[PDB]
Amino acid sequence: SAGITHYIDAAQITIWAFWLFFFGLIIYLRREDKREGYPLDSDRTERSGGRVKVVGFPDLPDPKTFVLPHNGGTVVAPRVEAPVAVNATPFSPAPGSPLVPNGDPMLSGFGPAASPDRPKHCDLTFEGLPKIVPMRVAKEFSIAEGDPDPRGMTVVGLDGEVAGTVSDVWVDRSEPQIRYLEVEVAANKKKVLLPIGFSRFDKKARKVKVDAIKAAHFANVPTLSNPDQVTLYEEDKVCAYYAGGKLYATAERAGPLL
Amino acid sequence: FTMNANLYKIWLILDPRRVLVSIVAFQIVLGLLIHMIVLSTDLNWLDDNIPVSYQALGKK
Amino acid sequence: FTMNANLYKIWLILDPRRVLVSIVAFQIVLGLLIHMIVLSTDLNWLDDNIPVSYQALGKK
Amino acid sequence: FTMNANLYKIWLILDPRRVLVSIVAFQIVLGLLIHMIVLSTDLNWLDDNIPVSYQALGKK
Amino acid sequence: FTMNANLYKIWLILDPRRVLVSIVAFQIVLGLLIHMIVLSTDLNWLDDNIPVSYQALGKK
Amino acid sequence: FTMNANLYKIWLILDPRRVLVSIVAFQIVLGLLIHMIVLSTDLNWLDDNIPVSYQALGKK
Amino acid sequence: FTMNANLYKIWLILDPRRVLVSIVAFQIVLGLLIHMIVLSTDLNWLDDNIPVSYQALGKK
Amino acid sequence: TGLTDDEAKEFHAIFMQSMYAWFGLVVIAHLLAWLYRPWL
Amino acid sequence: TGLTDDEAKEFHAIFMQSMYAWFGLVVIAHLLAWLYRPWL
Amino acid sequence: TGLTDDEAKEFHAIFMQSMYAWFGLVVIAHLLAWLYRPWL
Amino acid sequence: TGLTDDEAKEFHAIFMQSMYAWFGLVVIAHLLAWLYRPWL
Amino acid sequence: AMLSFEKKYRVRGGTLIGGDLFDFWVGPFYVGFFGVVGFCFTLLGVLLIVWGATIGPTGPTSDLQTYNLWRISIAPPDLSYGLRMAPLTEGGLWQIITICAAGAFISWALREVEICRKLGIGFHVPFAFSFAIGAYLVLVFVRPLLMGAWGHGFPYGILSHLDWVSNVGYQFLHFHYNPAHMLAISFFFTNCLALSMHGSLILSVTNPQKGEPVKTSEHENTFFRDIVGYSIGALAIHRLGLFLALSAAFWSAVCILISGPFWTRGWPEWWNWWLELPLW
Amino acid sequence: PEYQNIFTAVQVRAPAYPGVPLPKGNLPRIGRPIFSYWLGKIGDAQIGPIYLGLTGTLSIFFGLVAISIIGFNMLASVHWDVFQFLKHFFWLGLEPPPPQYGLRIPPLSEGGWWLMAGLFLTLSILLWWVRTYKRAEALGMSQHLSWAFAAAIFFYLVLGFIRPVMMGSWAKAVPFGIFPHLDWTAAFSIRYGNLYYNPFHMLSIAFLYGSALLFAMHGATILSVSRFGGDREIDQITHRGTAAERAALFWRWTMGFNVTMESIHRWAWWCAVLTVITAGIGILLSGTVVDNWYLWAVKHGMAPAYPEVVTAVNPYET
Numbered sequence A: 001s002a003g004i005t006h007y008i009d010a011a012q013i014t015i016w017a018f019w020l021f022f023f024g025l026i027i028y029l030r031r032e033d034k035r036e037g038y039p040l041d042s043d044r045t046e047r048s049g050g051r052v053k054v055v056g057f058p059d060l061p062d063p064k065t066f067v068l069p070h071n072g073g074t075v076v077a078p079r080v081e082a083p084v085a086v087n088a089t090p091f092s093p094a095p096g097s098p099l100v101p102n103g104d105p106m107l108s109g110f111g112p113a114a115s116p117d118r119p120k121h122c123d124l125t126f127e128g129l130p131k132i133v134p135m136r137v138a139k140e141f142s143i144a145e146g147d148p149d150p151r152g153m154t155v156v157g158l159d160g161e162v163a164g165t166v167s168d169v170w171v172d173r174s175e176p177q178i179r180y181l182e183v184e185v186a187a188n189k190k191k192v193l194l195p196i197g198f199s200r201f202d203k204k205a206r207k208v209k210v211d212a213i214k215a216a217h218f219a220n221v222p223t224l225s226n227p228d229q230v231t232l233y234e235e236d237k238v239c240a241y242y243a244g245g246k247l248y249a250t251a252e253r254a255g256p257l258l
Numbered sequence B, C, D, E, F, G: 001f002t003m004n005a006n007l008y009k010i011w012l013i014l015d016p017r018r019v020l021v022s023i024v025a026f027q028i029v030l031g032l033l034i035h036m037i038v039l040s041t042d043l044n045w046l047d048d049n050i051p052v053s054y055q056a057l058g059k060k
Numbered sequence H, I, J, K: 001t002g003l004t005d006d007e008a009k010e011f012h013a014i015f016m017q018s019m020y021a022w023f024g025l026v027v028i029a030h031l032l033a034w035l036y037r038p039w040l
Numbered sequence L: 001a002m003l004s005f006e007k008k009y010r011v012r013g014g015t016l017i018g019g020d021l022f023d024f025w026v027g028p029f030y031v032g033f034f035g036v037v038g039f040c041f042t043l044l045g046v047l048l049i050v051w052g053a054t055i056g057p058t059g060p061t062s063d064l065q066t067y068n069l070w071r072i073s074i075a076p077p078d079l080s081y082g083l084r085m086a087p088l089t090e091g092g093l094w095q096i097i098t099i100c101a102a103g104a105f106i107s108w109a110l111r112e113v114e115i116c117r118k119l120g121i122g123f124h125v126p127f128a129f130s131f132a133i134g135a136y137l138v139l140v141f142v143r144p145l146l147m148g149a150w151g152h153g154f155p156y157g158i159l160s161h162l163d164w165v166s167n168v169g170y171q172f173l174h175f176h177y178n179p180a181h182m183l184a185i186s187f188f189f190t191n192c193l194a195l196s197m198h199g200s201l202i203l204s205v206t207n208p209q210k211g212e213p214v215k216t217s218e219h220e221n222t223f224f225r226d227i228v229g230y231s232i233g234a235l236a237i238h239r240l241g242l243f244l245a246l247s248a249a250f251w252s253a254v255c256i257l258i259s260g261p262f263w264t265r266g267w268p269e270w271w272n273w274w275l276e277l278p279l280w
Numbered sequence M: 001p002e003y004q005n006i007f008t009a010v011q012v013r014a015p016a017y018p019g020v021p022l023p024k025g026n027l028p029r030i031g032r033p034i035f036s037y038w039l040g041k042i043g044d045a046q047i048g049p050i051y052l053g054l055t056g057t058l059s060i061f062f063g064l065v066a067i068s069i070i071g072f073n074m075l076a077s078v079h080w081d082v083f084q085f086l087k088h089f090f091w092l093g094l095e096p097p098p099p100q101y102g103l104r105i106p107p108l109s110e111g112g113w114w115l116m117a118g119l120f121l122t123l124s125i126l127l128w129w130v131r132t133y134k135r136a137e138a139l140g141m142s143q144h145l146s147w148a149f150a151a152a153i154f155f156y157l158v159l160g161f162i163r164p165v166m167m168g169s170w171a172k173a174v175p176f177g178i179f180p181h182l183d184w185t186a187a188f189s190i191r192y193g194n195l196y197y198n199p200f201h202m203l204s205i206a207f208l209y210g211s212a213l214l215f216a217m218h219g220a221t222i223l224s225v226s227r228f229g230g231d232r233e234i235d236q237i238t239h240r241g242t243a244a245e246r247a248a249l250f251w252r253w254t255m256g257f258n259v260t261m262e263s264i265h266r267w268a269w270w271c272a273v274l275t276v277i278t279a280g281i282g283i284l285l286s287g288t289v290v291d292n293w294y295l296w297a298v299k300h301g302m303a304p305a306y307p308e309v310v311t312a313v314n315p316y317e318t
């Protein structure tokens, strides 16, 4: 008998092996996925006083340690993070309801204005010099031939009003580029950072538009504990404020449209 | 049982936890592979009609 | 269900707004679904020529 | 006391302007749908030749 | 068993709400599903022509 | 069939500019939709030619 | 033997709240699985025409 | 939801009038449709 | 979960009766459906 | 589960009769279905 | 872990009979299944 | 439930439509007015694919009816129907499921939009999503329209749609010669390359050899500069990858848009314009 | 309105960077940098220096040899008419040894240039492999690239060398030409009864589509959180910022779950390596194990049936 066709061929079983390796892969990737934000926030946890820490399937992976270079530290993941109050109040007492920011929305530090507490230290070059520093601290840097020098352009907010003028340019000493625009504010001549991401140029006019906030809001830009360098804490703090204006800076960004 | 004697010192070099799990995996796998090798050869024992054919227990 | 007089207490458990929207959507789609299923079978009520032929009220 | 005497109270749970907008949207969508559904069966009123065939009013 | 319980303690273990919503969603799903399973077999109740054939009840 | 008209108040709740363009857009789209529906059906005016189909003005 | 000296404390190692859910889901999934598997072979219990064929043997 | 119990009688009053107006308009269209072309 | 034990008293009544109304129109519609066209 | 020993008696109390309600309508529909059209 | 030694006795006890309640429903159904429809 | 840092952002407002009406969360998903339209479109779409599977091409009792996942398939109407709505059980169903799919993808896109407005992030993602929505539309709306009939659309079935691709592909004899096809394929392959390179990099620096600390930007640039004399840099690599994948989708959309409506001959024949230039 | 971080609108220069320093043994670096205002318009404007060791030189060497055999051969097929070479270039190619020869080393005029170009190409690709492992070690980094390159090398090897040796015939490897290698692809599917029904080729296709999906999604994300320096992924990985937060949340609120700044790079990594690895497996079973995939799909009941509305009588059966 030389014809007993087997119903099982290498192609079936290779498709079997694959799916098994697959499932293990998926599972694993979802585990690396819980090295942050976990366990979750329910009132399942609060109701039970915490006896239901929310982690789901799969579960959380044993911590991993990152050894920052330069006497920098050591970070772990997953970690235990201290809760932080919410600077807002429930739009409804029902769960899943959004919260309204407390007080003046741009000040709230809630919503598009919220942000975490990153180190109060500076990111560093390879050598260990403050990575992000101004061109005034980073002597070498230079505009690229054929690019308007931002230095001296007028910074202008979302409504038209002048905001200030570019007093300097902050650069990456690691990957040479403009990261932050410095702004001598008109209303008080204080110096603030302006993330490049929020800034549009109008080279033919030497203006630097900013849809984010109004010219006035530039007065409240979060500040630097040193005008010649900036910490991780301070960057988030700077940007999130402008970001808040995307939903706050006007009595209309709140939406609807209809 | 090394078989003599300072070949224990090998676990002074290669993490015992890692070596163990490694072997567990390697075997748990190899078993599946060779099983499949046997399933496609003369040593196959399932789609053989051994010792009496089962799809000819009725018709299909 | 909750049919033991204390079946109001269910709303300390299930949010009225969210449950409301769910009921609404589920009902609307359910309606559309069942409608097309019936329109898709012999119980069709459109493709019957009711009560007198309409494609012989224009074509040929 | 019966009901339909405190059912205005519904706008204390559902914001009135938006409820209007949603209703209108549903009306537009349901409208096009139903039209297409009717057009999808024999009661169709366009590819019917009313009152005289137009696809044969382009050759004779 | 003539045994409707032992200990009702389960709601000290499983969130009453979660089980609630789950039962509702899954049941609605099982319902639609099985409905579909039955409509696809001989046990069909729509395309049966019940109680007398309808597409051959009028002109065609 | 109640008593309050005064339905001008509608623009105190609904933004006029956006409503304006919304109707504008919807009207152009509904326009295209309808045009494509009739042109694809019997009431067609293009795939005909009056008083004679024009590419059958010459066969050659 | 095979007598299990202490299968309590098993809930001191494995969080029970989890364990139940584990079992429930696993059983519903396995249930559907086996159901469909039996549905796909000869052991089918739906498409049998019980007790009289319903299509074209069912009054109509 | 920024309404009083009295600003929910009013909106409701005009809403009801308008919706019934719409449904009415609909019943009219359904009569023309029914006269020229009964569907049952 | 937004409500008190007393407001979960209020919501529930209107909820139950309107759901019953819906069910009424539906069952009614079904009896109507049954006369003009028996399906079972 | 942040509920008391009394409201897990209660929840259980109303829940069981409820599931029993569902089961009732279920057995109803299934016997009626077996009567009109046997499947096994 | 997050139980006392007394409530895993309590939990296990309730658990086993509950499980067997399930096994019972199953062997019963399989008995039914085996009677109407023997498979081997 | 929320991430351990989520509550602080779960602000009110940002809609386009609905306002506080549907301005809430469910589990981790954001609802919004478009989540509701989306869920409705989606649910009816799927529930109808279930009914199509239920009925089969010749009726629920025929042998072509099936619930097997590889083979369930819902196909368009014949070409004889043109752009008209065709009877339900003759491809009508497929048309409605399509309307639902287009509406669901568009709702999904608009809901990602409200989510950008809430979180205050750029709207690069739903714009990028819109490229897939576009490709889907050419494959069901644009091409079959330009082609005077909706039947030119692909059927919705796992392998049967593969068959559609196959025979449509083969009407042009050797599809590989479609030049836009050549582009799109180039991007799909290169995209897959940069992604493997970025992926590899991030993971190679944040987790270096034991005995080494998280690596640096300087390392990053130095490695790919070491290997290939160039490093596009961190920001931009994220920019490129977005370019490649969106373009890959683009050229797929154009390569199929021209296969019919603007070209009917075999595709290798297209390359004739090159052998006939007055240079040779 | 808002900058999109598509085009660097205002650049800055600084003296070029020779890079982090390599240990003893790792040779000097060569070439001295330049800047392209235009690369700069979209990315790091710095061009080079480059590293070249024994490895790098032996790889550039083999690789260029292989490029010459293929090219010179193509000029020969048009009679040394560089014009004609230019005209039909796309269609030119260097075909493989004929089957008549099996796996024997063939005469120059009958395929031997292909075996030599195939040989030299492979050695040069695998030398570039070693190159990236060396360049990756000099930096203390890990071999994640090398595990991927090794996967793509896997597919390559399966295509032109492994399957051929297994099938006992150099004529089964792919020929070097644009249009020629496209044709090789189509003929390959045809010869084995339509490759669409090959499960592995379906998976490889899900994974290619997935590399486009993930990189487009992630990439769009990083740009949308570019405003918060999300591009600076390394520190968002060590020290989570509102970029990584807004990022994880956009997706969380959208599709119900999410990843992290570190993990997305693993989903993406694993998705790419998977393409090539299903892909190679896919070519491995063709002819070695399965000869007609459509039939295979029928045997496993996966091919759909359609009402047979058009059919043709079999002359072979008359």
Ligand code: BCL
Residues within 6 Å of the ligand: E014, E018, E019, E020, E022, E023, E026, E034, E037, G021, G023, G024, G027, G028, G031, G032, G038, G043, G044, G045, K022, K025, K026, K027, K029, K030, K033, K037
């Ligand atoms: C030829 C094959 C026979 C067959 C023989 C059998 C046999 C034999 C058996 C069944 C059984 C089952 N059959 Mg049968 N069955 C057939 C025909 C059918 C048909 C049909 C369309 O004709 C249907 C609908 C069914 C349906 C079913 C189910 C009623 C039942 C399995 C329940 C289950 O999964 O347990 C799931 C298990 C659990 C413990 C879940 C309990 C529910 C919990 C509460 C889950 C609810 C969701 C939960 C609350 C979520 C919790 C919240 C989260 C924790 C967050 N059979 C044919 C006739 N059938 C089984 C049975 O009878 O039950 C014993 C069984 O052993």
Ligand code: BCL
Residues within 6 Å of the ligand: C001, C002, C007, C010, C019, C034, E024, E025, E027, E028, E030, E031, E032, E038, E045, I040, J022, J024, J025, J026, J027, J029, J030, J031, J033, J037
């Ligand atoms: C030959 C087959 C028979 C048939 C045999 C059966 C059988 C047998 C059964 C059904 C049952 C069902 N059939 Mg049938 N059925 C047929 C034809 C149809 C057709 C049709 C178009 O022809 C339809 C629409 C239906 C429809 C239905 C549903 C009405 C019902 C179960 C719904 C469900 O699962 O909900 C999911 C359930 C829930 C979500 C829970 C109930 C809802 C809430 C929780 C109750 C209110 C609680 C309280 C007020 C608190 C407030 C809570 C808020 C509501 C949230 N059948 C054919 C003719 N049908 C099943 C049934 O009757 O269910 C009892 C059943 O046993």
Ligand code: BCL
Residues within 6 Å of the ligand: L105, L132, L133, L134, L135, L136, L137, L139, L164, L165, L166, L167, L168, L169, L170, L174, L175, L176, L181, L184, L185, L188, L248, L249, L251, L252, L253, L255, L256, M185, M186
């Ligand atoms: C048949 C033989 C011909 C050929 C015929 C065709 C034809 C014909 C076509 C292609 C198409 C394409 N081919 Mg080809 N092709 C050939 C050989 C190849 C080869 C190769 C190595 O040989 C490759 C790499 C490709 C690759 C490609 C791409 C260039 C392109 C597909 C991408 C795309 O459509 O994006 C588009 C992506 C989408 C449309 C997805 C959109 C997503 C939507 C909005 C949402 C989906 C939601 C859904 C619900 C998700 C499910 C989730 C559930 C909710 C859980 N082809 C062969 C030689 N090829 C197709 C094309 O051009 O694209 C239009 C096309 O029409």
Ligand code: BCL
Residues within 6 Å of the ligand: L176, L181, L182, L183, L185, L186, L187, L188, L189, L190, L193, M156, M159, M174, M178, M179, M181, M182, M185
């Ligand atoms: C798996 C299927 C077949 C096949 C399937 C396809 C399909 C289908 C297509 C291609 C196409 C192409 N294939 Mg291929 N291809 C095969 C295996 C190969 C191999 C190889 C040695 O293994 C090579 C070098 C190539 C090379 C090429 C690229 C030249 C091109 C698309 C660019 C791309 O994705 O770049 C990513 C990589 C880079 C950017 C790195 C650097 C590129 C190097 C230098 C390219 C060398 C060759 C070059 C063409 C010669 C001079 C330049 C010309 C002016 C263009 N293929 C496999 C065996 N290939 C696409 C096309 O249209 O062109 C025919 C296309 O449609």
Ligand code: BCL
Residues within 6 Å of the ligand: L165, L189, M067, M121, M125, M152, M153, M155, M156, M159, M185, M186, M187, M188, M189, M194, M195, M196, M198, M200, M201, M204, M205, M206, M208, M275, M276, M278, M279, M280, M281, M282, M283
């Ligand atoms: C022709 C019609 C057939 C077809 C036949 C094939 C065949 C045959 C193959 C594919 C292959 C694949 N097909 Mg196909 N394919 C079809 C239609 C499609 C469709 C579609 C929409 O219809 C799609 C999306 C695809 C998709 C794909 C990709 C998923 C996959 C290969 C990924 C890849 O790039 O590997 C390419 C990447 C590499 C080869 C590695 C590159 C690295 C090398 C080493 C680079 C060296 C560079 C070099 C040294 C630089 C110097 C240049 C020198 C001059 C050479 N095919 C139809 C069914 N397809 C593969 C497959 O599935 O096999 C099972 C394959 O080989």
Ligand SMILES: CC[C@H]1c2cc3[nH]c4c(c3C)C(=O)[C@H](C(=O)OC)c4c3nc(cc4[nH]c(cc(n2)[C@@H]1C)c(C(C)=O)c4C)[C@@H](C)[C@@H]3CCC(=O)OC/C=C(\C)CCC[C@H](C)CCC[C@H](C)CCCC(C)C
Residues within 6 Å of the ligand: L038, L041, L042, L043, L044, L045, L046, L049, L097, L098, L100, L101, L102, L104, L105, L108, L109, L112, L125, L126, L128, L129, L130, L131, L132, L133, L155, L156, L157, L158, L161, L245, L246, L249, M209, M210, M212, M213, M216, M217, M220, M254, M255
């Ligand atoms: C355009 C470049 C690439 C891209 C980008 C892209 N896709 C995206 C996004 C982006 C940026 C999103 O943000 C969005 C997303 O949510 O991320 C996953 C999305 C998305 N990418 C997905 C699909 C997808 N993208 C693909 C490809 C591409 N998308 C390109 C590779 C592909 C393919 C073919 O390779 C697919 C299958 C979705 C998971 C998701 C959008 C999900 C969604 O819109 O959900 C709402 C709709 C439903 C849940 C279903 C609606 C119900 C329908 C009525 C039934 C289905 C009908 C369907 C037409 C039948 C087809 C059947 C098939 C078996 C043939």
Ligand SMILES: CC[C@H]1c2cc3[nH]c4c(c3C)C(=O)[C@H](C(=O)OC)c4c3nc(cc4[nH]c(cc(n2)[C@@H]1C)c(C(C)=O)c4C)[C@@H](C)[C@@H]3CCC(=O)OC/C=C(\C)CCC[C@H](C)CCC[C@H](C)CCCC(C)C
Residues within 6 Å of the ligand: L189, L190, L192, L193, L196, L197, L227, L228, M059, M060, M061, M062, M063, M064, M124, M125, M126, M128, M129, M132, M145, M146, M147, M148, M149, M150, M151, M152, M272, M273, M274, M275, M276
């Ligand atoms: C996840 C799988 C994807 C993948 C991954 C992948 N590819 C890779 C890698 C990885 C991980 C590498 O590590 C490696 C790389 O270097 O990445 C940039 C590579 C690679 N991907 C490339 C190609 C490639 N990969 C492809 C596909 C894929 N690879 C998949 C999409 C494709 C396809 C099918 O489209 C191609 C074309 C190469 C650039 C590179 C391997 C380069 C190589 O091996 O070099 C061999 C030899 C030469 C290049 C000869 C040198 C010729 C010089 C260019 C000329 C310089 C001359 C100089 C003037 C000196 C003077 C000369 C003197 C002799 C006179």
Ligand SMILES: CC(C)=CCC/C(C)=C/CC/C(C)=C\CC/C(C)=C\CC/C(C)=C/CC/C(C)=C/CC/C(C)=C/CC/C(C)=C/CC1=C(C)C(=O)c2ccccc2C1=O
Residues within 6 Å of the ligand: C022, C026, E025, E028, E029, M214, M217, M218, M219, M221, M222, M243, M244, M247, M248, M249, M251, M252, M254, M255, M257, M258, M259, M260, M261, M264, M267
């Ligand atoms: C009756 C009635 C009411 C019905 C009941 C309703 C029912 C049935 C309830 C069931 C509910 C459940 C179970 C689910 C709901 C289902 C929904 C709506 C559908 C899911 C749709 C959806 C889009 C699923 C797609 C799944 C997949 C695999 C998508 C592909 C995308 C991808 C590969 C996923 C993983 C990778 C992800 C998520 C990356 C995102 C991501 C990226 C890209 C970053 O760059 C980044 C950077 C820094 C930090 C974080 C991130 C980050 O998270």
Ligand SMILES: COC1=C(OC)C(=O)C(C/C=C(\C)CC/C=C(\C)CC/C=C(\C)CC/C=C(\C)CC/C=C(\C)CC/C=C(\C)CC/C=C(\C)CCC=C(C)C)=C(C)C1=O
Residues within 6 Å of the ligand: L190, L193, L194, L197, L198, L199, L201, L202, L220, L221, L224, L230, L231, L232, L233, L234, L235, L237, L239, L240, L242, L243, L244, L246, L247, L250, M006
């Ligand atoms: C830390 O991050 C990282 C770095 O930073 C340090 C790196 O440097 C690196 C190293 C990376 C590199 C050195 C990058 C190398 C780049 C590679 C290999 C990609 C290869 C691409 C090419 C050769 C270019 C091919 C394209 C062209 C020549 C231009 C083509 C122009 C065409 C087709 C016409 C233009 C029009 C269209 C395409 C149609 C419309 C386009 C769209 C709709 C797309 C939209 C795009 C956007 C961006 C919004 C990595 C991996 C990294 O991860």
Ligand SMILES: COC(C)(C)C/C=C/C(C)=C/C=C/C(C)=C/C=C/C(C)=C/C=C\C=C(C)\C=C\C=C(C)\C=C\C=C(C)\C=C\CC(C)(C)OC
Residues within 6 Å of the ligand: M067, M068, M070, M071, M072, M075, M105, M115, M117, M118, M119, M120, M122, M123, M156, M157, M159, M160, M161, M173, M174, M175, M176, M177, M178, M181
């Ligand atoms: C005029 O031109 C001058 C500059 C001279 C040069 C120009 C050159 C040009 C323009 C060349 C152009 C070349 C092109 C465009 C080539 C394109 C090639 C393509 C697209 C190829 C596609 C696929 C090819 C594959 C997959 C080939 C695989 C071959 C393999 C894997 C061969 C392996 C062989 C080995 C390892 C040999 C082993 C030999 C042993 C040791 C076994 O012998 C005993």
Ligand SMILES: [Fe+3]
Residues within 6 Å of the ligand: L198, L202, L238, M218, M222, M233
């Ligand atoms: Fe990235």
Ligand SMILES: [Sr+2]
Residues within 6 Å of the ligand: B054, B055, B056, B057
């Ligand atoms: Sr048997």
Ligand SMILES: [Sr+2]
Residues within 6 Å of the ligand: C053, C054, C055, C056, C057, C058, D042, D043, D044, D045, D048
């Ligand atoms: Sr008519």
Ligand SMILES: [Sr+2]
Residues within 6 Å of the ligand: E042, E043, E044, E045, E047, E048, E049, G054, G055, G056, G058
């Ligand atoms: Sr019947």
Ligand SMILES: [Sr+2]
Residues within 6 Å of the ligand: C042, C043, C044, C045, C048, E054, E055
């Ligand atoms: Sr009828």
Ligand SMILES: [Sr+2]
Residues within 6 Å of the ligand: D054, D055, D056, D057, D058, F041, F042, F043, F044, F045, F047, F048
């Ligand atoms: Sr006409």
